[PDB]
């Protein structure tokens, strides 16, 4: 219930998804010492990090590939100019 409304607010459709209700620690020691991280949150933290690194890796490959294609186009243009020079024409035109 209310999955669509949560999406309209930028939240996860399932309340068990990302948010303070899930990711925050469930408990802590009475004296105030924080509890060790929950095993579920550790799995999500590692899974999110791999997704973040994959985003960077894909972005850098496309940026590098676009530069390589642009570099080839610049190189191709320069090659045409060099071949224009040759021996001076003679004959009827002199």
């Amino acid at each position: 219930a209310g999955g669509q409304w949560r999406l309209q607010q930028g939240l996860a459709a399932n309340p068990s998804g990302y948010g303070p209700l899930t990711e925050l620690p469930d408990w802590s020691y009475a004296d105030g010492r924080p509890a060790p991280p929950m095993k579920g949150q550790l799995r999500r933290k590692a899974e999110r990090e791999t997704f973040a690194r994959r985003v960077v890796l894909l972005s850098q490959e496309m940026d590098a590939g676009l530069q390589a294609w642009q570099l080839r186009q610049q190189k191709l243009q320069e090659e045409q100019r060099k071949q224009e020079n040759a021996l001076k024409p003679k004959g009827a035109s002199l």
Partner: protein, 94 residues
């Protein structure tokens, strides 16, 4: 008194099936999702010429790891300690 000849949902004479109000809404809901997928596939970031070769280095290195793991199969090492530790089954108190 009203019976469908043979099986209900197969054959020349079948039990009629009617589209409910929510059945239409579910199909329209999935149609809207696919319509938005058409839009996001209409704007590629790079052309086919620019895309070519931009990930060949990573793909080649990925397959070399597969080859390395495939050709690394071998029996595991055997240790003297493992064989000698079996004598402990008859260890007794003095």
């Amino acid at each position: 008194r009203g019976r469908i000849p043979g099986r209900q949902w197969i054959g020349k004479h079948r039990r009629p099936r009617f589209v409910s109000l929510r059945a239409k809404q579910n199909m329209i809901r999935r149609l809207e999702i696919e319509a938005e997928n058409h839009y996001w596939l209409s704007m590629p970031y790079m052309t086919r010429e620019q895309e070519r070769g931009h990930a060949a280095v990573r793909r080649r290195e990925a397959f070399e790891a597969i080859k390395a793991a495939a050709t690394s199969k071998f029996p595991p090492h055997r240790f003297i300690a493992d064989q000698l530790d079996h004598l402990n089954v008859t260890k007794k108190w003095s």
